Amino acid sequence: SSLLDLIWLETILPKTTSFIQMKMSIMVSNQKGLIKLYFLSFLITIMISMTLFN
Amino acid sequence: IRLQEDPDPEDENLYEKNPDSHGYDKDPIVDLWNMRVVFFFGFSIVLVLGSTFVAYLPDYRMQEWARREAERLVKYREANGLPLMESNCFDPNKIQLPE
Amino acid sequence: HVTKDMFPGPYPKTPEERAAAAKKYNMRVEDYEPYPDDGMGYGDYPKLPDRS
Amino acid sequence: MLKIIIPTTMLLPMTWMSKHNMIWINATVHSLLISLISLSLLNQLGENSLNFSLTFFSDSLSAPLLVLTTWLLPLMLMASQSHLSKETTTRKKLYITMLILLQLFLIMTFTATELILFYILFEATLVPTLIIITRWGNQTERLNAGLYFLFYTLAGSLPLLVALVYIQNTTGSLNFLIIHYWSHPLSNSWSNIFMWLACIMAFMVKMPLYGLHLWLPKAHVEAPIAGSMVLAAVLLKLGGYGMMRITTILNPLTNYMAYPFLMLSMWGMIMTSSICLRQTDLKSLIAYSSVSHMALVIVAIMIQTPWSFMGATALMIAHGLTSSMLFCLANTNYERVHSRTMILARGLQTLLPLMATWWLVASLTNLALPPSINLIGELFIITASFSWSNITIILMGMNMMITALYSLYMLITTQRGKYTHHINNIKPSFTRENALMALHILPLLLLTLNPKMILGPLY
Amino acid sequence: KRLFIIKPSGFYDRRFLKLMRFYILLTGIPVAIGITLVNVFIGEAELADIPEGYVPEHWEYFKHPISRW
Amino acid sequence: AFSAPAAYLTHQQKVLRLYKRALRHLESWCVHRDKYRYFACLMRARFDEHKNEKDMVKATQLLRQAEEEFWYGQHPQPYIFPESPGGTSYERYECYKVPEWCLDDWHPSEKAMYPDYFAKREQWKRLRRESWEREVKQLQEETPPGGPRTEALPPARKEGDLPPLWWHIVTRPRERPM
Amino acid sequence: SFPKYKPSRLATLPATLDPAEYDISPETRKAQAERLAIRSRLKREYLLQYNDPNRLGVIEDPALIRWTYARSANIYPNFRPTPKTSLLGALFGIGPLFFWYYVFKTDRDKKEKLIQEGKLDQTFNISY
Amino acid sequence: PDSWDKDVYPEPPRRTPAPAPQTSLPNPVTYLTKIFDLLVDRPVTLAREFIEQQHAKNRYYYYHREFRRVPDITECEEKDILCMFEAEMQWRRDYKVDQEIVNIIQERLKACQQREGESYRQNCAKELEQFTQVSKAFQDRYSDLGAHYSARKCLAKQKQRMLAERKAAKEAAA
Amino acid sequence: DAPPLTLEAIKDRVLYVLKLYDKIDPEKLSVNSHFMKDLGLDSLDQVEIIMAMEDEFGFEIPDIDAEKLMCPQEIVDYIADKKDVYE
Ligand SMILES: CCCCCCCCCCCCCCCCCC(=O)OC[C@H](COP(=O)([O-])OCC(O)COP(=O)([O-])OC[C@@H](COC(=O)CCCCCCCCCCCCCCCCC)OC(=O)CCCCCCCCCCCCCCCCC)OC(=O)CCCCCCCCCCCCCCCCC
Ligand SMILES: CCCCCCCCCCCCCCCCCC(=O)OC[C@H](COP(=O)([O-])OCC[N+](C)(C)C)OC(=O)CCCCCCCCCCCCCCCCC
Ligand SMILES: CCCCCCCCCCCCCCCCCC(=O)OC[C@H](COP(=O)([O-])OCC[N+](C)(C)C)OC(=O)CCCCCCCCCCCCCCCCC
Ligand SMILES: CCCCCCCCCCCCCCCCC[C@@H](O)O[C@H](CO[C@H](O)CCCCCCCCCCCCCCC)COP(=O)(O)OCC[N+](C)(C)C
Ligand SMILES: CCCCCCCC/C=C/CCCCCCCC(=O)OC[C@H](COP(=O)(O)OCCN)OC(=O)CCCCCCC/C=C/CCCCCCCC
Ligand SMILES: *P(=O)(O)OCC(C)(C)[C@H](O)C(=O)NCCC(=O)NCCSC(=O)CCCCCCCCCCCCC
Known about the structure:
The structure is cut from a larger assembly and holds 9 protein chains of 9 kinds. Chain B is mainly alpha-helical. Helices cover about 50% and strands about 0% of the residues of chain B. Chain B has 3 helices and no strands. The longest helix of chain B is centred in the middle third of the chain and has 28 residues. The chains are: A mainly alpha, B mainly alpha, C mainly alpha, D mainly alpha, E mainly alpha, F mainly alpha, G mainly alpha, H mainly alpha, I mainly alpha. The interface between B and E is medium-sized, with 16 and 18 residues. Strand 1 of chain E pairs parallel with strand 1 of chain H. The structure holds cardiolipin, 1,2-diacyl-SN-glycero-3-phosphocholine (PC1) (2 copies), ligand PLX, 1,2-dioleoyl-sn-glycero-3-phosphoethanolamine (PEE) and ligand ZMP. One 1,2-diacyl-SN-glycero-3-phosphocholine binds next to helix 2 of chain B.
């Protein structure tokens, strides 16, 4: 009941996936809205697209 | 307190106003007729009629037909010395094995 | 009628927390003893004697 | 199947145009009429299924489930009318509409002749269930329960959609008759392994398989009475029906990919019975009992023999009826004392005699007491598993012992003993509640009388 | 001397049992009477070879009169 | 069971309970009445021998030694009265005990079957309802500001009053209800 | 003298044999008085609510609520992954699965070997 | 009786010994049998005679359905759905008939064992051999087809069995 | 089954037992005489009296309640109250 059903079977599928999604969501949405920053990101993306993709 | 919230009302008892209550509704007449329709339809109609319908369902699974066919085949085979159960479901003459 | 502060909580770390937990469970501070913090999820629930 | 589908789509306008005090009466009467009409599907053939048209067909496996759904709707109506007295007329009509939509989707699911339509409908069953749970549940945990249920089921089912469209592209048709007559062996390869995994994992999540079951205690405990009744009686049987239907094309890969699922099902059946032994909540106890029974059904389907399929079908029907009855009894006791703790209310044997009799009969049917169809299905599954291997008897015997132990423990704790001194609001059992219990139990005994009606096509 | 026996209300359980028995026997008794009369008077069919050139119906392929109906 | 327990057992109470328990187990060993009388007189002689002791530490030591001796020499299957907790007839009638709150939920026809009893029951209910405020006021007047330090309850200090917290004690189910 | 009694987990020490019962400090008496006072306060509250004529319902038990909450809902938030928890979870949730897999796989391998070798008594084994 | 075929359901001729009493005491079994005949057998016989007389007034018949043979899965072409369906239905009906044949033989075996009683081991050797042959053939035909059995799977199993037999015969003749 | 008890029967039986006790003079024994103050007994004698009453009536008086039964009338009232005797 406790160790398997309520702790580890909760830790493997539903809790770890939710934690990963929350962390990635915070990482993606943690932007200060600076055009300089994301336009430099645009420049990096343009260079990567030009070079890596052939 | 942080809200203007109603207090939790006390639980209501149907037997308080209607001593002979079936528990279906507050109105006595509607309660009685709900009980009547539930009991009549459910018990009488569904239980009795559906159960006798299932009991007297026609033998579409061919249990009796299969028994009669097996009896005829056993009679024919044992009356002529043939095996009662064939060793092959299909004909080796009609089966062409690869070489 | 039970308030949110009258529910089992985390493992008590300080004497203030232990005193609050003992008061919560209607138990004396000296008689209150939580399960060891092994990460098994007991929390601040008291470890009453194993008798029936 | 239109003679059954259309009456439900007419039940909807009846519910929305009835008077405020006649909605329950009309819905119950016409649901019983629809059930009586749907009893005709039990006249099955001995060679092939009943192919009504290009879209809907009925089989010896689909018929008992349809009859169970049509019979279960009025019982849900009775319980809902019990616990929804103070709701407004519009919300009562909305609740009845949700129940009607769920029944309609279940009927179309069990009668769908194509795999993609079956997928669409058995996914459509989530929306009314989620609305019912997250809207008319009592506790704060209904939201989390609905999230768990929805996301478990969908994470299971999306790869099933991908597998179905891939199978359609590869073979040309998803029609069940075509995929059965034109079935070809599944070679041992990673691609076939992952197709097998997609299909079987979707249906295992729906079953639920051990290790994929948390959503079941969460949803069943926190759902209203009607939601709990439909979740255990029918919605759990979608996985078994799908696995019986889908395993046609998965051979001979099933002979080798079934080991992890068989081990999980057996050991988790033991584990969930043991969990039932030490449960402080009655609804949780019933939910874990459901988990154990569906794990046994999973074992039967995975071993995949003609004797296992019959036992699986019988166990599905019997478990549906028994779980509905147990949930109804627990809901009555909850309505008495407004709490789900099992040891809070005791002495109910001396406070409510006939309800104690209903409890005793339900507990006797929960454990495999012969000649009940519960025992018939369980014994067929146990014998098939014994033929599969000779230690499955050890596992099944342990499970049966723990099943009897926890069933009688629930009965003794809830009924026997001395009543709680301070609980003085336990009014005499209502005629409605007693009629609900009688309508739950009598069909079980009649099916015991006539067992071949629920043994599936393999009979 | 006789002492009062304190018991829970059994009127509601007795009423439910009476109503359930009545509604089961409301249709059960007529069904039993009809089945008995059918069995006694309109007995079961006798198995016989199909006459040459005759095509019977399915209800003529079934035996019991109620199943044939 | 009718007396509120104290915070502790005194030395005299401990030794008296040991005396009674030892006599009971000796009677279990000595089935016959004359033999039991002989050995019980010897046991009381031992207790009289140790009756006078100025050193309470030595008295406690003797009590501990006697307790160890009893635990070694106890009857594994002592005699227990049928109604006593270990008895064969213990708690047999707990299923027949039904309360008056269950009684008042009866149908009007069931109530009318017993006209005279329910009149006295209504008189009892009026007596209960007319005294609760006095009972609770008396309880809150006598208790210390800190709170009750024991489970004892006060009597009725006035002529027209009833002892507080009396309803369930008075109306508890009979020993043989049915 | 007489043989000593060794208390166990499932056969505890009797109260009359506890050495702590014969060494009573004045602090112990104060602790006992405090425990009795706590019990008396709880008993008084319960008896007041139980003998209230106007009460119709269940007297809520905060102790019962705490017990049912700790047994069910307060387990995961207080769970920390430690070596002990990890080892116990791995053992109790994996070892039985692989053990039964090994047992059944060996049994079925032996059965299949016998079937292929054609020296297994399969006569009358019609039902499967 | 004429209800069932005596050749399909064999039964040895009964040999009831003639009673040869050796005591002057009355026979309580004989007296009780006479009372049973006078109190039960005659009333039930009269009731059944009335019932049969009622039945004879409204006599009607029911027939046994006949199925003509259709080409089987061996004759069916590959992915010919109509012929495949016909062959599958015929194979299923034949499977049911074979199951009932095995049931008939098993019933015969059980009845012979019970009839022979204390000497069933020797006197029932004839019925045990028939059951052995029937069970062996039935198992060889429908042993491990599976839950989703079909005429194609049974044909494949028969082909495998025939290939094994041909290989064994060729090895023996080599 | 068994005939019901009465207050008079309980009193007669307890006085019977106490008069068969050899440390109590039956002439100076009344239903209101105290075991310690005016009968001259002690704690062990009171324990023996309680055990004798337990044997007489076939039920056990708990030790917490037995210590306070210091009078034959108190014993009668306790036994009648436990046995539900009101006449
Ligand atoms: C109160 C609440 C209850 C709730 C219950 C739960 C909920 C229930 C829900 C509803 C359920 C619905 C069920 C539907 C059932 C449908 C009917 C059905 O399937 O019937 C089956 C079947 C019907 O057969 P069929 O296929 O229609 O036709 C049979 C033949 O082909 C043709 O037969 P035939 O041509 O030979 O003629 C036969 C004819 C005529 O037969 C006779 O006449 C035979 C007797 C003749 C005796 C004559 C004696 C002499 C009298 C005159 C003497 C005068 C002279 C005296 C001289 C004195 C001496 C000098 O009799 C009949 O037809 C019998 C009809 C029986 C109808 C049964 C209906 C059941 C109830 C349905 C409704 C449900 C609700 C309850 C209603 C209750 C109503 C009461 O009937 C039976 O099985 C009847 C019983 C069988 C015999 C008794 C049992 C024997 C068991 C022995 C073994 C076990 C022993 C060990 C015990 C355990 C261990 C200790
Ligand atoms: C060769 C002939 C063979 C037999 C053929 C039989 C054919 C019968 C044809 C007539 C049927 C319709 C009339 C009777 C209907 C039942 C009434 C009854 O019994 O009431 C008594 C019972 C008991 O009556 P009561 O308890 O109210 O009255 C007792 C008497 N007093 C007034 C003194 C109190 O009625 C009820 O309980 C009422 C419940 C609700 C009934 C609603 C009926 C709606 C209309 C009928 C719908 C039927 C649908 C069936 C399903 C579909 C078809 C399978
Ligand atoms: C004491 C009472 C009885 C008195 C008897 C007096 C002596 C009579 C002597 C002669 C008896 C026979 C005379 C007629 C002969 C022909 C019989 C006949 O027609 O047989 C036809 C057939 C015979 O089989 P058949 O295969 O020959 O069919 C021929 C069909 N005909 C002739 C009509 C074209 O028998 C039956 O069908 C059996 C009777 C009907 C069974 C089903 C009844 C259902 C009733 C309704 C159920 C409930 C519905 C409502 C539900 C909701 C309620 C609220
Ligand atoms: C208060 C005291 C209680 C006990 C006493 C009650 C009164 C006495 C009752 C005694 C009954 C004891 C058992 C004896 C039963 C006799 C009748 C029984 O034997 O008949 C069965 C009849 O079986 C029925 O089929 C059972 C009906 C099953 C109904 C299923 C449920 C009905 C719909 C309910 C909807 C719920 C759906 C649930 C999921 C599907 C046997 O079937 P069968 O031998 O062949 O019938 C012969 C007729 N033939 C030859 C023409 C076929
Ligand atoms: C799939 C379908 C298969 C075919 C089905 C065919 C059958 C059709 C089924 C018809 C449904 C039967 C009616 C349903 C129950 C009706 C409920 C009802 O009667 O209402 C209660 C009703 C009115 O509402 P009140 O209680 O007064 O509320 C007042 C609020 N101030 O109560 C009463 O007072 C009425 C009392 C006398 C009426 C008695 C009615 C008896 C029932 C029989 C009438 C039906 C006629 C038969 C037609 C047969 C057609 C085949
Ligand atoms: P009343 O209030 O007058 O009671 C007098 C008392 C006893 C309270 C004294 O005032 C008192 O406290 N005296 C000093 C303390 C004392 O007496 N200590 C010793 C008493 S215990 C003792 O001596 C027991 C020894 C013999 C009995 C041992 C029992 C073991 C045998 C049992 C065997 C089990 C089966 C037979």
